[PDB]
Structures are given as C-alpha cells and as structure tokens.
C-alpha cells in the first residue's frame, strides 16, 4: 500500500531531448524522427522578448543559424519552419531512439509528467496537473524552455506540453506540441493575467477514494448529499461543479470501496465546511487535486509500461 | 522558479530492471554486468514466509530453477549465491545497458528516487527520504519487491535501496544492494516494530531556504535563537537535534539568501510553537522534511545528468 505522487518512467523521453542554440540563446528541443521541436523564442534576444515580431525575426535566420546538439551527436539542419509558437527544425538524421509517440492536447484537470531539462540534459521528473486556468505549478529555471510534459500508455508516449514561460505568480505556461498555448497566454515578456483558478473536484474525490483504499477513513462520515446540494458547496469553495460524467468516471473506485460517490461527496462537503482540524489524509493537511481517477487506479493496481 | 518534489530521470535504471521467477513467486531484479540482484524471498512459498530457513530453502534450488526475463530477452543462469538478504544470480550475458554504477549504503535523512516495478517493468518514479527510523514511506504493491532506490551523479548511478517488505504502519523496509536491511528488520512475515520516528531538522531548514528563494517569506520572523535553545524546542517536537555539522551543510543556502541559519531556526521554532495558522509554505500546510540541502541547491541551480 501507500500513495505517492508518481511520475511516469522518463527513459523514453530522455532519449529525445536535445539542445537548440540560435545566437546566444540556448534551450531544449524534442527530437522525434527527423524533426526537432522547440519554443520559437529561441530566436529572440533579451530585448526582442519585450515585443517580438516572430515572422520578421525568423526571416533573418537560415538553417545554419540553428545549432542542434544531441549529447555530443550533432545534427545537420536542412529545413526550418514555425508552427504557431513552436519551431520545427528538419534534421538530416532520424532519432534512432524515437519511441512510439502521439501529440495530444490535454484537458484541464488531467495530469502529466514533466521532464525538466537544461542544455538538452534531463535534471528531474515530476507529476502535475493542468489547472482549470491552463497554468501548471512546475519547477522551471532559465534554460528550461523546451522541456516537455507527457503521459505513457504501455509503449506509446503521448506528448502534451512544452514549457515556454513563467507568469507573475510563479506559475508556468506553455503550449501543446503543435505550438498552441494552453490558455490565453502569448510568448511575449509582458504582464499577463492567468485568471481565477478552481480546485479539480473529481480529482479530490479520486484522492479520497485512494485514502480509503489505504486505510485512511476517519473522514468517512455518516451523511449523504445530492449533486445540486454538493454543487452549492462546491462554488462557495471554488471547486469545479461535479457532473454525472464525473460520477461515472469514479465508478470503478466506488465499486472497489463500496462507497457511493454521493456519500463520498458528503464527506468532502464536511471537510470543506469544517476543515481537517489538524488531521492529515495520506500525509497531507490539504485536500489534494492533482490525482485523476485513472492515476489512483493505476497506482492501486500496479499498471506497468515498456 | 517553483519548487517540486523531483525524482532523478529514471532511464539509466529502467535499462537494468528484469523479472525473476522461482517457483510461482515473481519479483523484480536488477541486472548489472552479468549479475542479477533480487530479494532472497523469491525462493519462498506463501507458507515459508512465516518463518523461512533461507539456507535450507536455497539448497533445494538449482540454477535452472531461476527464470530471469529481461523484457523478452531471456537470460541463462549459470551460478547463484545468497549475500545477506539478496540473491545474486550469475547470468551468461552482461547487460549491454549497464550504466556506470556504485552500491552505496545511505544515511538516515538522505533522499533517493524509487523506480517502482512489477514483473520487471517500470510503473512510476518518485522521491523520498530514508527516515531516521530506517523506514521509507513509499507506494508498493504485491510484486514490487526488487524495485530499487537510487541517486545519480552525472553519469554514475548510486544504488542505495532494494524493496523487501511492508510494515504494520503502511511503511516500507528494505536493504542496501549488499542485502543488509536498513534498520532492525528481518525478511519474515512476523510483526515487527519500526520504533519512534523523528523529523529531519536540517531538511526542514533546507526547505525553508527553498521557500525564501521562491518568494515565500511570511514566516521570516524577527527573532534569533541559539543551538541549545533551538534544540530544546526540537526534542519537544520530535525533531532531530541540530548540530554544527548541519549548520555548515546549510552554509551555501545561508550565503545565497543572506539569512543566518540561527535566524532561520528562530523562524522554525515559532512555526513549531504556533503552527501555520492555516497558511501554506511552498504549497504545503505541513513542515516538509524530505528535501536535503543538496536537493534544494540542485533544484535552484539546475544541475543536469547524462
Ligand atoms: C525559457 O526557458 C524561459 C523559462 C522561464 C525562466 C524563468 N522561469 C521560466 O519558466 N522563459 C522565458 O524566458 C520567457 C520568454 C518569453 C515567453 C518570450 N519569459 C518569461 O517566462 C518571463 N515571463 C513573462 O514574460 O510573463 C509575463 C510577465 C510576467 C511578470 C511580469 C512581466 C511580464 C519571465 C522570465 C518573467
Ligand atoms: C514483495 O513484493 C512484497 C511487497 C509487499 C506486498 C505489499 N506491500 C509490500 O511492500 N513483500 C512481501 O511480501 C514481504 C515478504 C517477507 C519479507 C518474507 N512480506 C511483507 O511485506 C508483509 N509484511 C510483513 O510480514 O511485516 C511484518 C508484519 C507486519 C504486520 C503484521 C504481521 C507481520 C506484508 C505483506 C504484510
């Protein structure tokens, strides 16, 4: 037993990380088949970033202005193009470590693993959630741009995030692998509002089911509630409204534990109204919302990948 | 910026995981050069585990009783031996993916990454700490035994933990890679006491320095204290006593932030005496002790590996 915030094994993604240099700026790229993907602001000087005309800036660049380095293997760039906020550098060599992969645009509330990288070399791996306001709460320094977020289904890597920027909150924003930002953000150094975040209710419930599976059951109360009744409590506390789609998603956990979803909701409602009274759940003094129902099920059934 | 519990990239370790079967029992092994390492209780039936005579049980086994499977690559066993609580199976093939590696016995309070595995295939990666009472708080199911904990120094993997068992607390116990248990535990299905745990004071301070580096400074108070004065508060709250060795280890963080260690101690003392008053630090409502000073420094300087 036990419950931990667990990332996917990162080996398949490690084999795809490269270093991309244009001028003095160096960031990370993702090398898949014969294409390297990276944030387009690799082409900017520090001054360009205040208000870059990326088309005009890219026109001044040629294939040989982009240095792509894979460890010490070094790639010849034979084509470049800009797709939304990413550059696609065509290289003369297919990555021999390319895994089976897909590009996906994830939904708010979903989770993924981030492989944090600098100069094209992995530093660490951690799990997180796409917030309802399309930010993530990551750990990113200068040079981390181009680091990617991903999920694994057995042998297939689904890439879902590429890091671009940090917002005036310490929160992080980026794009999918077609270069479209999650949320309203643009790749410019100018003040930008994230907007109000909300707590991912279905993930909190999943985590309460995790707790029960692992022996933590003090919060299991006596009451029940209704969807509307619970949803009134939800928006008081800036939780996303629960839907029948969410109830259905929680079905397997409900069947494993014998606790109806609406009964679990009544426990959550009391936790929101009364706090935790200095107690903890699964080692936490806060209600955790960065585990999806699938995350809980994979961790309590031992799903593997390779 | 931002601060996350970050594991090491696991690719180098993924390449070493194998499946070991003896009779009906299947667990994970670590394949390095031409030796596979795994918990010796792979040789036990469910009934043997109540009080196994491992020498007597191992005598009934021959090389061909051990099935070692690496993905679908399958290894010929040409020798076996028991070292403390691990078996060493000699195989006829050196692992072509063997990284530069070392076997280390870590100290309580240190951290390492765990690659959780089932049937020889990685499921997830997460960071944790060797508690002062030589347990870890992991996430481990049936079949996870033989999963390993490790640290990376650039290209060298230092293996420090192999998982063996779960204790009547939901906590986990295991050995180093020479098969010596951390703590007083034995590999027998019989009730076993872990003993009182304590909070790792130097790690809490490191995490408070992390917080200041990342803008969380509300807890920075006005007071100072002394080592003895703080150490009296420490043992009231079952924190390890702080030593001058710990003060020196915190030197670089003290120099980066301009906060004397004893000033930070005075903040910690007030947090222990008064609680957090419903506030959070780095997204947590509890004082976190599973980041070492080195962990903080690597995450706030961007150290990479390959
Ligand atoms: C690329 O690796 C780099 C990663 C960030 C450095 C520190 N943390 C990070 O995640 N990203 C950048 O340098 C971007 C480049 C832009 C997109 C052209 N810049 C930023 O992330 C800045 N943030 C920003 O401009 O957001 C708007 C803003 C916020 C606050 C105040 C003014 C503007 C960041 C370095 C401030
Ligand atoms: C091997 O993969 C397995 C992993 C554990 C299964 C569930 N969680 C795990 O980490 N380990 C075992 O099956 C060991 C085998 C022993 C060492 C021969 N057994 C256990 O971990 C049991 N724990 C145990 O015997 O500890 C003492 C005890 C505790 C509580 C009550 C009675 C005895 C565990 C399966 C209870």
The reply to whether B72 falls in a domain is yes
Q: Which residues contact A32 (CB under 8 A, 6 or more apart)?
A: A16, A95, A98, A101
Specify the 3-state DSSP secondary structure of A159. Answer: strand
Q: Are strands A35-39 and A77-83 parallel, antiparallel or unpaired?
A: unpaired
**DSSP H helices in A118-260:** 201-213, 227-236, 244-249, 251-257
Query: B284, B146, B141, B138: which is closest to B208 by C-alpha?
Result: B284
Instruction: Check whether residue B127 and residue B151 sit in a common domain.
Output: yes
Specify the 3-state DSSP secondary structure of A221. Answer: coil
Tokens of B202: 């130097």
DSSP state of B93: S
Do A42 and A22 contact (CB within 8 A), yes or no?
A: yes
Number of domains within chain A: 3
User: If residue B259 lies in a helix (H) or strand (E), which one and from where to where?
Assistant: none
Q: Quick one: resolution in A?
A: 1.6
Instruction: Check whether residue B202 and residue B225 sit in a common domain.
Output: yes
Tokens 């509307």 sit on residue: A228
Ligand 2 centroid – CA A294 distance (Å): 26
Give the number of other CB atoms < 10 A from CB of residue B217. 14
Instruction: Check whether residue B1 and residue B111 sit in a common domain.
Output: yes
Tokens of B135: 């347990």
Instruction: Check whether residue A168 and residue A190 sit in a common domain.
Output: yes
Do A12 and A100 contact (CB within 8 A), yes or no?
A: no
User: If residue B213 lies in a helix (H) or strand (E), which one and from where to where?
Assistant: helix B201-213
Tokens of B190: 């019989």
Cα separation of the two ends of chain A: 23
- Angstrom distance (rounded) from CA A265 to CA B264: 41
Query: Bridge partners of B150?
Result: B113, B159
Regarding the beta carbon of A31 and ligand 1, being less than 6 Å apart is answered: no
The reply to whether A94 falls in a domain is yes
Instruction: Check whether residue A137 and residue A1 sit in a common domain.
Output: yes
The reply to whether A153 falls in a domain is yes
Regarding the beta carbon of B189 and ligand 2, being less than 6 Å apart is answered: yes
The reply to whether B282 falls in a domain is yes
- The CATH number given to whatever domain includes residue B165 is 2.40.10.10
Mutate to test the interface with B, among A31, A111, A125 (most CBs of B within 10 A): A125
Instruction: Check whether residue A121 and residue A3 sit in a common domain.
Output: yes
- Angstrom distance (rounded) from CA A84 to CA A179: 5
Specify the 3-state DSSP secondary structure of B19. Answer: strand
Do A41 and A52 contact (CB within 8 A), yes or no?
A: yes
- Residues of A marked active site are found at 41, 145
Ligand 1 centroid – CA A167 distance (Å): 7
Which approach determined this entry?
Answer: X-ray
Q: Of B68, B99, B130, which residue constitutes the final position of a domain? A: B99
Task: Supply φ then ψ for residue B82, to 5 degrees.
Answer: -115, 125
Q: What is the 3-state secondary structure (H, E, C) of B135-189?
A: CECCCCCCCCCCCEEEEEECCEEEEEEEEEEECCCCCEEEECCCCCECCCCCCCC
Query: A92, A117, A152: which is closest to A19 by C-alpha?
Result: A117
Query: Bridge partners of A153?
Result: A156
Regarding the beta carbon of B15 and ligand 2, being less than 6 Å apart is answered: no
Q: Of B46, B73, B99, which residue constitutes the final position of a domain? A: B99
Specify the 3-state DSSP secondary structure of A151. Answer: strand
The reply to whether B283 falls in a domain is yes
The reply to whether B306 falls in a domain is no
The reply to whether A306 falls in a domain is no
Residues of A in contact with B118 (CB under 8 A): 302, 304
A53 φ/ψ sector (left φ>0, alpha ψ -120 to 50, else beta): beta
- Angstrom distance (rounded) from CA B300 to CA B211: 11
- Angstrom distance (rounded) from CA B98 to CA A71: 18
Instruction: Check whether residue B109 and residue B84 sit in a common domain.
Output: no
- Angstrom distance (rounded) from CA A56 to CA B79: 67
10 Å CB burial of residue A244 (0-12, 13-18, 19+) is: exposed
B23 φ/ψ sector (left φ>0, alpha ψ -120 to 50, else beta): left
Task: Supply φ then ψ for residue A170, to 5 degrees.
Answer: 80, 10
Cα separation of the two ends of chain B: 23
Measured over the CA atoms of residue B234, residue B238, residue B242 and residue B243, the dihedral's sign is positive
Q: What is the largest CA-CA distance in chain A?
A: 69
Q: With both helix axes pointing from N to C terminus, report the angle between B201-213 and B261-274 in degrees, rounded to the nearest 10.
A: 100
Instruction: Check whether residue A263 and residue A184 sit in a common domain.
Output: no
Do A157 and A101 contact (CB within 8 A), yes or no?
A: yes
- Angstrom distance (rounded) from CA B209 to CA B228: 21
Q: Of B49, B72, B99, which residue constitutes the final position of a domain? A: B99
Q: Please name the residues between 234 and 293 in chain B that touch chain A, using a CB distance below 8 Å.
A: 280, 283-286
Which atom of ligand 2 is the closest one to the Cα of B146? 2
Tokens 């180098």 sit on residue: B12
The reply to whether A19 falls in a domain is yes
Instruction: Check whether residue A193 and residue A61 sit in a common domain.
Output: no
- Angstrom distance (rounded) from CA A38 to CA A89: 8
Instruction: Check whether residue B119 and residue B148 sit in a common domain.
Output: yes
Output the CA torsion B287→B289→B294→B297 (10° steps): -20
DSSP state of B284: B
Query: B146, B271, B288: which is closest to B203 by C-alpha?
Result: B288
- Angstrom distance (rounded) from CA B283 to CA B263: 23
Query: A175, A171, A176: which is closest to A193 by C-alpha?
Result: A171
- Angstrom distance (rounded) from CA A150 to CA A160: 5
Tokens 């050196």 sit on residue: B94
Instruction: Check whether residue A202 and residue A291 sit in a common domain.
Output: yes
Counted across chains A and B, CB pairs separated by less than 8 A come out at 163
Query: Bridge partners of B83?
Result: B86
- Angstrom distance (rounded) from CA A193 to CA A87: 25
Range(s) of the domain holding residue B153:
1-14+100-197
- The CATH number given to whatever domain includes residue A218 is 1.10.1840.10
Q: Are strands A156-166 and A172-175 parallel, antiparallel or unpaired?
A: antiparallel
Instruction: Check whether residue B228 and residue B260 sit in a common domain.
Output: yes
């Amino acid at each position: 037993s036990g419950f931990r915030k667990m990332a996917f094994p990162s080996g398949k993604v490690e084999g795809c990380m490269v270093q991309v240099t244009c001028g003095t700026t160096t960031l990370n790229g993702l090398w898949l088949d014969d294409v390297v993907y990276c944030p387009r602001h690799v082409i900017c000087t520090s001054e360009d970033m205040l208000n870059p005309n990326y088309e005009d800036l890219l026109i001044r660049k040629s294939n040989h202005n982009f240095l792509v380095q894979a460890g010490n293997v070094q790639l010849r760039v034979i084509g470049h193009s800009m797709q939304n906020c990413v550059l696609k550098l065509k290289v003369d060599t297919a990555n021999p470590k390319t895994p089976k992969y897909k590009f996906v645009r994830i939904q708010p509330g979903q989770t993924f693993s981030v492989l944090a990288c600098y100069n094209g070399s992995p530093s660490g791996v951690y799990q997180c959630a796409m917030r309802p306001n399309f930010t993530i709460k990551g750990s990113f320094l200068n040079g981390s741009c181009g680091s990617v977020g991903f999920n694994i289904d057995y042998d297939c890597v689904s890439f879902c995030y590429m890091h671009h920027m940090e917002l005036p909150t310490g929160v992080h924003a980026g794009t999918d692998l077609e270069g479209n930002f999650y949320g309203p953000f643009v790749d410019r150094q100018t003040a930008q509002a994230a907007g109000t975040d909300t707590t991912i209710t279905v993930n909190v419930l999943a985590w309460l089911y995790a707790a029960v599976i692992n022996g933590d059951r003090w919060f299991l109360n006596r009451f029940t509630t209704t969807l509307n009744d619970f949803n009134l409590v939800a928006m008081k506390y800036n939780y996303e409204p629960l839907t029948q789609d969410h109830v259905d998603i929680l079905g397997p956990l409900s069947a494993q534990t014998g606790i109806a979803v609406l009964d679990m909701c009544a426990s959550l409602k009391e936790l929101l109204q009364n706090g935790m009274n200095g107690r903890t759940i699964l080692g936490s003094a806060l209600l955790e919302d960065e585990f999806t129902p699938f995350d809980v099920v994979r961790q309590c059934s031992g799903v593997t990948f390779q």
